[model samples]
Target: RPKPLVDQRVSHEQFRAALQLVVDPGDPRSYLDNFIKIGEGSTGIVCIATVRSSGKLVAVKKMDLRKQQRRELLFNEVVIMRDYQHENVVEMYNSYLVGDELWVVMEFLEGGALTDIVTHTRMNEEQIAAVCLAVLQALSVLHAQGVIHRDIKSDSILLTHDGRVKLSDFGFCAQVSKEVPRRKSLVGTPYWMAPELISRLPYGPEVDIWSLGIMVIEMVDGEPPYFNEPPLKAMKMIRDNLPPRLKNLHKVSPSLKGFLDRLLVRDPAQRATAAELLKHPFLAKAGPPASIVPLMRQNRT
Candidate 1:
């Protein structure tokens, strides 16, 4: 006989109470309109939708529960994703369960992912510092909450037209406690992986700072180190190379270079924490958040 479908109703109902969902026994389409495809990943399809009554633009992530092998695991992630409230973290507005698909509604970031800016536009030190400051603030919150964001990259950073930067994509995040103080699982993109991560050593929140270091280099040089190399070659490069250097080393400010130096430290213990990095000279000089507005317009289609 085929195995019975996992009954997630009990805990799912608990999530419904905790999250205070927007709709019950109602389709998301009833409230959201003007669906426009925005992006997609292993989790689901993302679209920009308008709230029918308020005429507000929001992001909707539609994930099919039928395709998920572990419903509880998905629900756990959903709970984690919905709990955090930070200025620099993407805000999950509400959620809806329509048949086998979960519809997650979140704030719409019009400036799109930082990946586009990293790929299409070069950033000055101040602009780069501004981005760093925003990400660090977000990291500070997650770290303080005993959460490890195992993934941090340009693609996971989103921006708004007014230049507000926010962290997104928490699928790889893990919670830490007395029993689980560090994570050893090999997650995140190879190019941005910290040395300890590639070495298969247990790591903590410092891993995210290291990934941010790679993203900082990408902002200056247009791509992470060994972006064109094969996966194995890239992993080897990350391991053998103590700390990846920026291609435009001489072009950026010393303060920015020093900031990256702190972030790329091979030893997780030696690596500067998000709170410490926020006070660094380079980040202290970060231009006003709105300074990025003009540059965003420069590369916008």
Candidate 2:
């Protein structure tokens, strides 16, 4: 059985057949109106391409699978995004393997990421709560499928042109069975990582909550605690001491603080789960994320 009962509604073979795939095309590709390189790094190069016939914009990430590890990473993304379907989860339209390069196409969020938004302006409690609510919704769906997103930070949170928030970047996502619902491997950005993750203890899906709480602080204070510290030192600092707080922040609301307090608890058992966080009083204080879209556009433009 293909796992994730929420997505088992469609057979794997049927789902695979439904994806629009392709191989290498000419530089002036006839299928895509314009394929323009937007960014590139050691892992991959990203391009914004428009579908020739539909005039729809899509982001295509190109990765060279010259090694076994790279191949497995692509496989990881394919399996996770292929089964994940939620409004707040970035939609992977399709993927194609052309020679050694794997092209994974996904929805183009013109408004960009929460990282950009934070750099542009500090989010008020209402705006930050909206972002957290959307993230929690996505996290809830992910945890239900027995998947743990080892990385959850502002950089992974994206905003569409319409102002909807979506979680992206599944590079470190881990799959677990209920029988073995714990992971001990230390992975994820140090500043946002949970205490258990750094301690290399078996951690459950709730680790995402710690990162989400950290993200809340990021939204309000414009950076994670210990953002200036080196990665190794940051991990040791987080693991060795009490939970970090937004030291200089004073504008954050009480309900929002209450939400973060529970989420930042080092004990996974004491931490608030995504589902429980959704009904938080802080969410009641939130305005829609749509209110923040204009600001994102301005920053990007």
Candidate 3:
């Protein structure tokens, strides 16, 4: 079953009162010791924290709200995660507003980032199919909810110790109506960006499928197709190149290759939807095992 959305009616005063019991005041020793820094980016730092009272493990993402390049962008993430809760998506626990810092407490997993895991682990066809199934299934739900996760990449995909895939990082996500055009601004990691995105064309959820295709190739070959080239050249290639060369992917099965082709179609109109992609053989037959374990720990209370 899917998770429930955070109760919006929970007043800040009540929430803060509950957190006060958990907060460490003297030297912030418990906070510092319970959480060990694991990853960081330009906007925030992710730390692994354990709830002292319950011994549950959780991930706390700390960011200085004052330094946000786009305040609306950061708030959009908070709004979406608070309203939309799903099993395949990262679950938000609580948002702590302490002075200038914003603490996003979330469910933690032991498998780490997908990029890091894919770097050392060469997944067999079955494993790649399993991972993609969970990712695409979650993307379908997002699209149905009228949300666009503009930044979909290996780095944003997190894995649980039991091999379940969870999509995280909503910094670039946007909500749109059927009549409104999706964001036209170019955003997302360069390597996994869609062709139209590089061309500065208005796009929607289809862009995500394009990125997913690139990531599939990355998973199969252990690296993106054009990692060595300069950024400008790479963008140019993605825009002009038709039928991305799969020479590095000769070992991949034909079924998977065909599925990728449809997903990464040059024209956005022709690109597959999340729902359509979910029905593909790659996802339908070899998805994650049904007995996948729940993210077992909750370190931050």
Candidate 2 local lDDT, residue 175 = 80
lDDT of 2 by residue, 206-241 (tens): 889998888888888788888887777877999999
Candidate maximizing TM-score = 1
Candidate 3: 10-residue stretch with minimal lDDT: 1-10
Query: Candidate 3, TM-score vs. the true structure?
Result: 0.83
Worst 10 residues of 2 by lDDT: 1-10
lDDT of 1 by residue, 1-301 (tens): 0111221686556644543353434567977888888766656788888889989788988777656544444554466567778889888877777665777777888888888787877888888889998999989988988888877888889888789899987767767878888987777777888888888888888889998999988899898888888767788888887688877666778888888899999888888999898889897778987888876755454
Reference-based TM-score of each model: 0.87, 0.86, 0.83
- lDDT for model 3: 0.71
Candidate 2 displacement at residue 154 in angstroms: 0.7
Residue-level lDDT for 243 in candidate 3: 50
- How far does residue 229 in candidate 1 sit from its true spot (Å)? 0.7
Output the number of the lDDT-best candidate. Answer: 1
| Model 1 spans > 4 angstroms off | 1-26, 66-73, 297-301
Off by over 4 Å in 2: 1-30, 67-71, 297-301
lDDT tens readout by residue for model 3, 229-289:
8766877888888857666556878788878888778888988899988888776556455
**Which candidate model has the greater TM-score, 1 or 3?**
1
